[PDB]
């Protein structure tokens, strides 16, 4: 209690010594580590790095088996940092999860973490694509009831649906923009919509904009500012045919008007566009 | 019965169709020298001349599918034959005479030339067998042994023979390609068989039994390991 400042400064002093008695025993036999770790019955940082230097993923499972919150300690102590595959079996606990999960024949489980790692995935597109594929092949190979399975593959079909967008990026603008084929990041709806419409994307046709209007429900800032930005370059490329088609592909008070001109066949097509919608 | 139908050029459409059927029975038995001995009897210029009923559009497609399959075994058996002919290390003569010391300095230097070419020839037989395995697995315009024409008259025998051939040979070609990729240390790509298979573009995963899947999932976890041993993440990407 009170005068604690002196009682948390004497802790750091005994804790810098069970660390100086541990290092000292790092060369020595670890058969005594188990008893030194139990004597000052925590000093876990030392017995946790002795279990790491060897293939005893069996020891770090025997440590967490008899412990009070070591699990929340061995994970935060992993991030700060043959029989070796039995200690790999225990070390595969954490994101390497799915691996020891396929091995344990825990497929359903492998599917959950494979999808979870697919979601956080932002650094590499080629990798976000691989993880879903694996997740999916995990789930399909697992033992879900035909109902549950139909849910996993539907919520999945969604993911594949957004991705497919960045996937079909033309090969004209990806050498223009000097982009790495696979070694590129998981792009977001905006970047995509804006890149599908760049003046770099030269052969931009009906499908490039249609998909640049399909990636608006993939947002989470100004919606209808872009709705215009894109319909407008949809006309710059027309060189006053494509506007025509994209109004043919949608099947309408989405598009703007007076706001747009912010002109002879824009209103002219906006008349057989009031007859079409009607 | 094929040479009888081939003899009369006015029955080339029937010769091919029947040649297909016959080769569909042999494929289900994996009699590739049987299937091919038939495949040569079909004049190399059959397709050109025949030029279309729904029964002739499919049989032309089926024939090429079958060639794509065969060529995916002709190039693997060559590749596989080679993988099993690696230059052997020089034999060691512990306690060597000064004569045996020099004969060995040379045998050891010659072997360090052959092992480089046996990776040389290998790479070119790996680059070639792979291509073929992706021509079958990713068959252009509707998948392997899958009709493009949909207005023919009912042929349950053939149709169900075409579903079966896909379930016997697509799981088997995948597992080979995995064995080729693993054998040459292309581990990153091994794992990318889970994109190819699960793909909604091909729906290859429907041609798999649940057991075959898991087996493919215990094959990929094996490539993954070797990628960890190299210091990369499970899927081959640098650990930043």
UniProtKB/Swiss-Prot annotation, chain A:
Widely expressed in fetal and adult tissues. Expressed in the brain and kidney. It comes from the Eukaryota. It is found in: Nucleus, Nuclear pore complex; Chromosome, Centromere, Kinetochore. Forms part of the Nup160 subcomplex in the nuclear pore which is composed of NUP160, NUP133, NUP107 and Nup96. This complex plays a role in RNA export and in tethering Nup98 and NUP153 to the nucleus. Involved in poly(A)+ RNA transport. Involved in nephrogenesis. It is linked to Nephrotic syndrome 18: A form of nephrotic syndrome, a renal disease clinically characterized by severe proteinuria, resulting in complications such as hypoalbuminemia, hyperlipidemia and edema. Kidney biopsies show non-specific histologic changes such as focal segmental glomerulosclerosis and diffuse mesangial proliferation. Some affected individuals have an inherited steroid-resistant form that progresses to end-stage renal failure. NPHS18 is an autosomal recessive, steroid-resistant progressive form with onset in the first decade of life. Galloway-Mowat syndrome 8: A form of Galloway-Mowat syndrome, a severe renal-neurological disease characterized by early-onset nephrotic syndrome associated with microcephaly, central nervous system abnormalities, developmental delays, and a propensity for seizures. Brain anomalies include gyration defects ranging from lissencephaly to pachygyria and polymicrogyria, and cerebellar hypoplasia. Most patients show facial dysmorphism characterized by a small, narrow forehead, large/floppy ears, deep-set eyes, hypertelorism and micrognathia. Belongs to the nucleoporin Nup133 family. This is Nuclear pore complex protein Nup133. It comes from Homo sapiens.
Swiss-Prot record, chain B:
It comes from the Eukaryota. It is found in: Nucleus membrane; Nucleus, Nuclear pore complex; Chromosome, Centromere, Kinetochore. Changing residue 205 to C: In NPHS11; decreased function in nephrogenesis; unable to fully rescue morpholino-induced nephrogenesis defects in Xenopus; decreased interaction with NUP133. Ubiquitously expressed in fetal and adult tissues. Part of the nuclear pore complex (NPC). Forms part of the Nup160 subcomplex in the nuclear pore which is composed of NUP160, NUP133, NUP107 and Nup96; this complex plays a role in RNA export and in tethering Nup98 and NUP153 to the nucleus. Does not interact with TPR. Interacts with ZNF106. Plays a role in the nuclear pore complex (NPC) assembly and/or maintenance. Required for the assembly of peripheral proteins into the NPC. May anchor NUP62 to the NPC. Involved in nephrogenesis. Belongs to the nucleoporin Nup84/Nup107 family. It is linked to Nephrotic syndrome 11: A form of nephrotic syndrome, a renal disease clinically characterized by severe proteinuria, resulting in complications such as hypoalbuminemia, hyperlipidemia and edema. Kidney biopsies show non-specific histologic changes such as focal segmental glomerulosclerosis and diffuse mesangial proliferation. Some affected individuals have an inherited steroid-resistant form and progress to end-stage renal failure. NPHS11 is an autosomal recessive, steroid-resistant and progressive form with onset in the first decade of life. This is Nuclear pore complex protein Nup107. It comes from Homo sapiens (Human). The chain holds residues 674 to 924 of 925 of the full protein.
């Amino acid at each position: 209690s009170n005068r604690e400042r002196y009682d948390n400064l004497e802790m750091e002093y005994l804790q810098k010594r069970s660390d100086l008695l541990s290092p000292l025993l790092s060369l020595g036999q670890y058969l005594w580590a188990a008893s030194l770790a139990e004597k000052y019955c925590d000093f876990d940082i030392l017995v946790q790095m002795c279990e790491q230097t060897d293939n005893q993923s069996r020891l770090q499972r025997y440590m967490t088996q008899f412990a009070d919150q070591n699990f929340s300690d061995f994970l935060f102590r992993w991030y700060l940092e043959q029989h070796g595959q039995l200690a790999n079996f225990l070390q595969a606990h954490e994101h390497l999860s799915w691996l020891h999960e396929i091995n344990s024949q825990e497929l359903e489980k492998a599917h959950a973490t494979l999808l979870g790692l697919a979601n956080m995935e932002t650094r590499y597109f080629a990798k976000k694509k691989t993880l879903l594929g694996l997740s999916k092949l995990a789930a399909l190979a697992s033992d879900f009831s035909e109902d549950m399975l139909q849910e996993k593959i539907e919520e999945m079909a969604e993911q594949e649906r957004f991705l497919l967008h960045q996937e079909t990026l033309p090969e004209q603008l990806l050498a223009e923009k000097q982009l790495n084929l696979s070694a590129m990041p998981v792009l977001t709806a905006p970047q995509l919509i804006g890149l599908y419409i760049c003046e770099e994307n030269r052969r931009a046709n009906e499908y490039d904009f249609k998909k640049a209007l399909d990636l608006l429900e993939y947002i989470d800032i100004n919606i209808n500012d872009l709705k215009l930005e894109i319909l407008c370059k949809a006309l710059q490329r027309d060189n006053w045919v494509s506007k025509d088609s994209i109004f043919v592909k949608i099947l309408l008070p989405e598009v703007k008007d007076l706001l747009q001109a912010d002109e002879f066949v824009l209103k002219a097509n906006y008349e057989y566009y009031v007859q079409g919608q009607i | 019965v094929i040479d009888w139908l081939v003899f009369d050029p006015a029955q080339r459409a029937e010769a091919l169709k029947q040649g297909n059927a016959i080769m569909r029975k042999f494929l289900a038995s994996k009699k590739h020298e049987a299937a091919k001995e038939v495949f040569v009897k079909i004049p190399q210029d059959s397709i050109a001349e025949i030029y279309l009923p729904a029964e002739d559009d499919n049989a032309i497609r089926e024939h090429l599918c079958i060639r794509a399959y065969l060529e995916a075994h002709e190039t693997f058996n060559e590749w596989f034959k080679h993988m099993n002919s690696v230059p052997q290390k020089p034999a060691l003569i512990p306690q060597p005479t000064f004569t045996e010391k020099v004969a060995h300095e040379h045998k050891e230097k010659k072997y360090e030339m052959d092992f480089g070419i046996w990776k040389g020839h290998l790479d070119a037989l790996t680059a070639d067998v792979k291509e073929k395995m992706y021509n079958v697995l990713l068959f252009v315009d509707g998948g392997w042994m899958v009709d493009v024409r949909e207005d023919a008259k009912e042929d349950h025998e053939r149709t169900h023979q075409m579903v079966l051939l896909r379930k016997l040979c697509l799981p088997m070609l995948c597992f080979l390609l995995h064995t080729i990729l693993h054998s040459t240390g292309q581990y990153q790509e091994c794992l990318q068989l889970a994109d190819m298979v699960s793909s909604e573009r091909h729906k290859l995963y429907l041609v798999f039994s649940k057991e075959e899947l898991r087996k493919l999932l215990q094959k990929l976890r094996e490539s993954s390991l070797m990628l960890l041993d190299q210091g990369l993440d499970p899927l081959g990407y640098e650990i930043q």
